[PDB]
Design a protein around this ligand. Structure first.
Ligand SMILES: COc1cc(O)cc(Nc2ccc(C(=O)Nc3ccccc3)c(OCCC[NH3+])c2)c1
Length: 314
């Protein structure tokens, strides 16, 4: 925890057997941040599992995907600096409310669908969608985290389950079906004690359908949760499914609303005075997009400027 002369570490909020997250604060900007701290000695040959995550995240920029700011590799630690999401967890939200109204699940699902549709357009699949992977920011907007791709068999598609060849996207829509189910009901559509009776239930593909589910809800579950992946609903069709649009009558807007197009002059200007060098060379240096400290500093001034705060380093 040494090269971090960029951040003032605060408290722990995430504890895993693979990794542990700490709240931190970006010295130069003032901006708050979350730092996933790994042990390479725990990973062993799960470096692949994380390095393919990082290159994945380097290629993503969406309003509903947790932003990656910075990577730092020391002798035996990997540090990911990530978008601060102080709204809380999707999962814990669900259990705190027992289950969300149909109209609240819809508002949220549309966010999930937005994230995932964008993921697919960029050439990836999440392949592990679940409540534990969705965070809320302070405006209660969802941030998809934790790319990575043990046992979320509960959320795994049947053809994934059984070593069959598969499309990631068709896999993901399955998992979105399960998620939807648990937003509206508060428990998993397929469940048992051991793993074997769980897998058996998935392969049969039929589930209890609580009294409170609406005709439209019951419909969309069926189209998402098809065993035969030929018969599952495409993303294409999800984006503007009548249930999806039942309350806000517009298709899901999946395209990145914050795209990276040009460099932002102000940020480039502050970064230029601070690093006592000229505009061209500061653009050249940022354009290298190394996700080093300068890339963090840039992304965070950009976020500072969106809050309408002055665009300044300390
Ligand atoms: C792509 O985004 C990723 C990848 C990944 O491997 C892990 C995470 N995990 C995160 C990221 C941020 C937070 C966070 O900002 N949490 C927070 C902030 C303020 C107050 C309370 C919590 C995070 O939170 C911990 C939840 C899961 N243990 C996890 C993102």
């Amino acid at each position: 925890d040494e090269l971090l002369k960029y951040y003032e570490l605060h408290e722990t909020i995430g504890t895993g057997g693979f990794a542990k997250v700490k709240l931190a604060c970006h010295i130069l900007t003032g901006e708050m941040v979350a730092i996933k701290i790994m042990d390479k000695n725990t990973l062993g040959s799960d470096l692949p599992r994380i390095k393919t995550e990082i290159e994945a995240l380097k290629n993503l920029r969406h309003q509903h995907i947790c932003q990656l700011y910075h990577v730092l590799e020391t002798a035996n630690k990997i540090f990911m600096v990530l978008e601060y999401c102080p709204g809380g967890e999707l999962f814990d939200y669900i259990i705190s409310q027992d289950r969300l109204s149909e109209e609240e699940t819809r508002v949220v699902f549309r966010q999930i669908v937005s994230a995932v549709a964008y993921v697919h357009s960029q050439g990836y699949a999440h392949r592990d969608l679940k409540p534990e992977n969705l965070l809320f920011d302070e405006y209660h907007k969802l941030k998809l985290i934790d790319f990575g791709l043990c046992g979320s068999l509960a959320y795994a598609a049947p053809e994934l389950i059984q070593g069959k060849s598969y499309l990631g996207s068709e896999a993901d829509v399955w998992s979105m079906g399960i998620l939807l189910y648990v937003l509206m009901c508060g428990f998993l559509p397929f469940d048992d004690d051991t793993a074997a009776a769980l897998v058996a239930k998935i392969m049969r593909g039929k589930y209890d359908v609580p009294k409170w589910l609406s005709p439209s809800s019951i419909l969309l579950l069926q189209q998402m949760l098809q065993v035969d992946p030929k018969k599952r609903i495409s993303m294409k069709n999800l984006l503007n499914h009548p249930w999806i649009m039942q309350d806000y009558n517009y298709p899901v807007e999946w395209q990145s609303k914050n795209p990276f197009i040009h460099l932002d002059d102000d940020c480039v200007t502050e970064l230029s005075v601070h690093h006592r060098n000229n505009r061209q060379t500061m653009e050249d240096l940022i354009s290298l997009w190394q996700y080093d400290h300068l890339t963090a500093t840039y992304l965070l001034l950009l976020a500072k400027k969106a809050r309408g705060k002055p665009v300044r380093l300390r």
